[PDB]
Amino acid sequence: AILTGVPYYILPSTSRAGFSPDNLRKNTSQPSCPLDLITQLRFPPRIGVPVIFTPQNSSLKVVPLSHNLNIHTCSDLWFCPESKIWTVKSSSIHRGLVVTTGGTFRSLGSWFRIERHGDSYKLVHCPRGSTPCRDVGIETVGGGGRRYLAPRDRPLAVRFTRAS
Amino acid sequence: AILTGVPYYILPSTSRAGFSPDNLRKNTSQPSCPLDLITQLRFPPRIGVPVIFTPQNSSLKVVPLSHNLNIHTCSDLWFCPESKIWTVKSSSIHRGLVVTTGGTFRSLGSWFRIERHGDSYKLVHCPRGSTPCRDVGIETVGGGGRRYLAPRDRPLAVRFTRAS
Ligand SMILES: *[C@@H]1O[C@H](CO)[C@@H](O[C@@H]2O[C@H](CO)[C@@H](O[C@@H]3O[C@H](CO)[C@@H](O)[C@H](O)[C@@H]3O)[C@H](O)[C@H]2NC(C)=O)[C@H](O[C@@H]2O[C@@H](C)[C@@H](O)[C@@H](O)[C@@H]2O)[C@H]1NC(C)=O
Ligand SMILES: *[C@@H]1O[C@H](CO)[C@@H](O)[C@H](O)[C@H]1NC(C)=O
Ligand SMILES: [Cl-]
Ligand SMILES: [Cl-]
Predict the structure, then answer these.
(1) Which of A23, A25, A30 maximizes ligand 2 atoms within 8 Å of its Cβ, making it the mutation to test the pocket?
(2) Which class for A110: exposed (0-12), middle (13-18), buried (19 or more C-beta within 10 A)?
(3) Range of the domain at A132
(4) Residues A78, B82: C-beta atoms closer than 8 Å
(5) Domain count, chain B
């Protein structure tokens, strides 16, 4: 029921507090975005900015579970020079790997999968498009009060809302 | 001088018809942009969309001539999932190499230089950030009635107008 190329909001399974790339939150053009995190919109809870899933297998109209895909933010506004494509980067101040935008389609570090998590789903990131994959969850360390997505093997249960 | 991190319009030395990434001319969301050309705004001539130059030593305040740099489009609107960073791609439809957006900062394929050319300048693209470089000029083949930038060793003389 997740469709290739269609925008969805990623939301926590039990919450209305969705997610946005940092650059879209800050409303300001910058000359580079070395660590454009995906952060939760909490005060008040806001739906965030949708993403699109692109399976590694290009013929697929339905996004399969447990299979390599790219994610990218769907937004006509963009305040970074880098891409809208999600990837993972290491950050010393955030105490390890974090999800960011600025990736490259079909690159070795670009691969995520959607998996079942109880009655919901979870996102995982798969280095080099292979297992072992790390669960994507919410972290706070180094986030200056914000909650950001990171592949640290603690899953955040998510639901998808079609953005149409 | 040409200043780092300051937006400039690239213009032909003797014309007001500047340049824009194709996705900005279309002004609608795209699922992907495999070949986002930089095309000339001719009829009527319009100044285009500015760019920012980032020298390979990104700490320099003046952009050096004859020295590797990245170029990216300066725009808050962006209709592609891929980056605003310039690169070169092969296109059989366009009978060879073409300038496009969707590059990656500091990547092998990302390097251009600004060189003096007569009393004006030219852009060159430098495979792997090394010489020899190929002069960037204007082409029409496969362009559907538009002119696009391509590194085919016939230089377009250009000037740079600071955007404000
Ligand atoms: C070229 O493309 C851009 C980006 O799509 C257009 O700007 C966008 O126009 C929308 C209207 O078609 C604006 O949507 C409104 O947003 C608010 C708040 O989210 C809603 O409450 C409201 O009901 C609309 O949905 C959108 O904000 C705007 N985006 C940006 C970043 O500016 C642009 O349209 C032109 O400018 C804007 C400001 C509008 O006034 C349009 O009517 C106008 O055509 C497109 N340009 C052209 C020439 O078509
Ligand atoms: C960005 O714009 C939104 C919507 O106008 C606003 O509510 C928010 O506080 C702004 N963020 C910053 C950092 O200015
Ligand atoms: Cl990972
Ligand atoms: Cl070249």
Answers:
(1) A25
(2) buried
(3) 1-164
(4) no
(5) 1
